[PDB]
Amino acid sequence: GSSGSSGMSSHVPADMINLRLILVSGKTKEFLFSPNDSASDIAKHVYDNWPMDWEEEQVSSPNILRLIYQGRFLHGNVTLGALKLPFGKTTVMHLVARETLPEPNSQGQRSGPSSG
Template sequence: MAASSSSSAPTTPTKSSVNASNKDKIALKLMRVSGQTHTFYFTPAHSASDVAKHVFDSWPENWTEDTVNTHAVLRLIYQGRFLHGNATLGALKIPVGKTTVMHLVSRETLPEPHSQDQQSQEKSGERRCRLCCAIL
């Protein structure tokens, strides 16, 4: 199991130090599309791109399906939303000392975020025609 130290570069602790040194870490249980999971440890300062790079560099041996060639295609999904690379775990208010599940997928690009106007229309069920014409 890999873990991050207090610096920005994740490290691998010895088995005896895992419980003691990870009390102040965020345990991310990453789930692949295949259903395989693995838990990694990070600090709140780590970003989604830091997580993707560390997972790529420490790829679990049992994750043999759907391997990737670069960390740049690894995407995290948290609470149904893709995380952009600069989003830190602390900014997402992920609790320290507890395990949080995220999905890990391979995807070249992220979907564009909706504008506030689109989101409010979708929630209220409004469908406005943007290219409407009136026939008199």
């Protein structure tokens, strides 16, 4: 018989965009995506990956599964391409599952305390 094994390389190309999928608390992993792929493909990919790390598992919507970037949220129709993101790089993004907001607190909101 015979056997062979040659091949090793750990570097992101300039045609793909490395994305960092983070979860609650922490735990993250480097991924790859195209500029023609939309948050869907990504969010989807993530879902497809891993066996199951979330009780809930019986939905299908880009809303519930929204991708966060730099704190903000990316649209489901948005695509790395439209994000004119730099190739051969690593982006940081957060993921969550909720048809609504995460916490009761929205940016750009001033309060008026009863006092002068």
